[PDB]
Each structure stands twice: as C-alpha cells, then as structure tokens.
Amino acid sequence: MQYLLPEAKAQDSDKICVVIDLDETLVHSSFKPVNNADFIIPVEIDGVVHQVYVLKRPHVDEFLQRMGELFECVLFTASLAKYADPVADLLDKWGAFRARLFRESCVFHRGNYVKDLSRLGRDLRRVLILDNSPASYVFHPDNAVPVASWFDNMSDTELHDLLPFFEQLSRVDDVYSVLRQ
Ligand SMILES: [Mg+2]
C-alpha cells in the first residue's frame, strides 16, 4: 500500500508527526440546532442539504497554532471530507495541518474505523495520535496522548492543559520513553 503521507518537508524531518482527531476532540457537531454555534455549514446527504451546527472546543485556536509550530500535524478523521474539509478550512488559520486524511484512509478493522499509524510512513518513535476514542489506535496504544471527549462544556481546558505535555514530548528522542513501550 501507498503511504498516507508524502515525504516530510526538510524542516519537519526531525519533528514528531501528530495525528489529530476532529469529532469530540477539536469540535462537536450536530444536526439539531444549537445556540451560539461557531460554524453552521451545509452538508449534502442523499441529495438533501442539511445544516450542521459546529461548536469549537475552548482554546482550539491557541492549541492549533502552537501544535502547528511544534509538530508535523496531520488531521486524521473517520468522517467524510464533505464535512471535515470545510470544518478544517474554518479551523486551521495557520496552516498547522500538513495533510488531511478522512474516512477512506482508515482501516475498517473488526467493526471500527482504525487509524493505523504504521500506515503514515513516519518513524513510530516519532509519532503521536490525539484521539478521544482509544478504539481508533488499537494497533498503537503506546503512541497515544489520552484526551477527553468534548461536547459543550465551555469550562473545558483539556487542549490548554495538553500543550505543556506536548511541549515536553517535542523535546524527547523517543515518545515511547514517555508513553512507555
Ligand atoms: Mg472523535
């Protein structure tokens, strides 16, 4: 199989590659109207245009800008591009995402959309995945940075609290020495 990512830019060759999830990690979307939504976009489903209300997780702007500076960031979602692409366009104002991967790039393993990290084409000692669903990284439990699922708690500070830990990881030679494998 062809790797999911191209050759790393010279500047990113020695940086860690971070696979970042979309739903319940950076945002929370819904078909039922929500007051004070950040994005309200059209998504076609079976020929009918539906309005999708998207809420941004607190501190996502600070998070993405910082992560984009520290690592070779990659958006990897199990959702379809017709939805994720527009959301990513509205989210990434710093070109933090070096690449965007959707549903088709996941491997449907034992009923779940798994994100096979070996599939990226990056040294596993230099790869991290931020996903609220441990099922997503069943093949790479030791490359994960645990993160809580978010829905609408505007008091949430997980993204802000995770930066210190990512800062730490950006300075180690092998993420396994920290995550432990
Ligand atoms: Mg998710």
Report how this structure was experimentally obtained.
X-ray
Give 79-138 as a DSSP string: S-HHHHHHHHHHH-SS--EEEEE-GGGSEEETTEEE--GGGS-S-GGGEEEE-S-GGGGT
Q: Cα–Cα distance between 16 and 73 in angstroms, integer?
A: 8
132 annotated binding-site participant? yes
Q: How far is the CA of 25 from the centre of ligand 1 (A)?
A: 6
Q: How far is the CA of 21 from the centre of ligand 1 (A)?
A: 6
3-state secondary structure of 38: coil
Q: In this structure, which amino acid lies at residue 29?
A: S
For residue 120, how many C-alpha atoms fall within 13 Å in the half-sphere facing its CB? 31
3-state secondary structure of 163: helix
Q: How far is the CA of 83 from the centre of ligand 1 (A)?
A: 14
Q: Examine the residue annotation and report whether 46 is marked as an active-site residue of this protein.
A: no
Q: In this structure, which amino acid lies at residue 64?
A: L
Catalytic residue among 23, 116, 123, 131: 23
Q: Do 96 and 67 touch, CB atoms closer than 8 A?
A: yes
Instruction: State phi, psi for 40 to the nearest 5 degrees.
Output: -140, 95
Instruction: State phi, psi for 141 to the nearest 5 degrees.
Output: -60, -25
Q: Cα–Cα distance between 11 and 28 in angstroms, integer?
A: 32
Q: Cα–Cα distance between 79 and 66 in angstroms, integer?
A: 25
This structure's resolution (Å) is: 2.1
Q: How far is the CA of 10 from the centre of ligand 1 (A)?
A: 31
Per the listing, tokens 């790479």 go with 140
**Domains (range + CATH), the chain:** 1-181 (3.40.50.1000)
Q: Examine the residue annotation and report whether 21 is marked as an active-site residue of this protein.
A: yes
CB atoms within 10 A of CB 86: 16
Give the containing element (helix H, strand E) for 140.
none
Beta strand segments in 68-121, E = 72-76, 97-101, 107-109, 112-114
Q: Do 37 and 29 touch, CB atoms closer than 8 A?
A: no
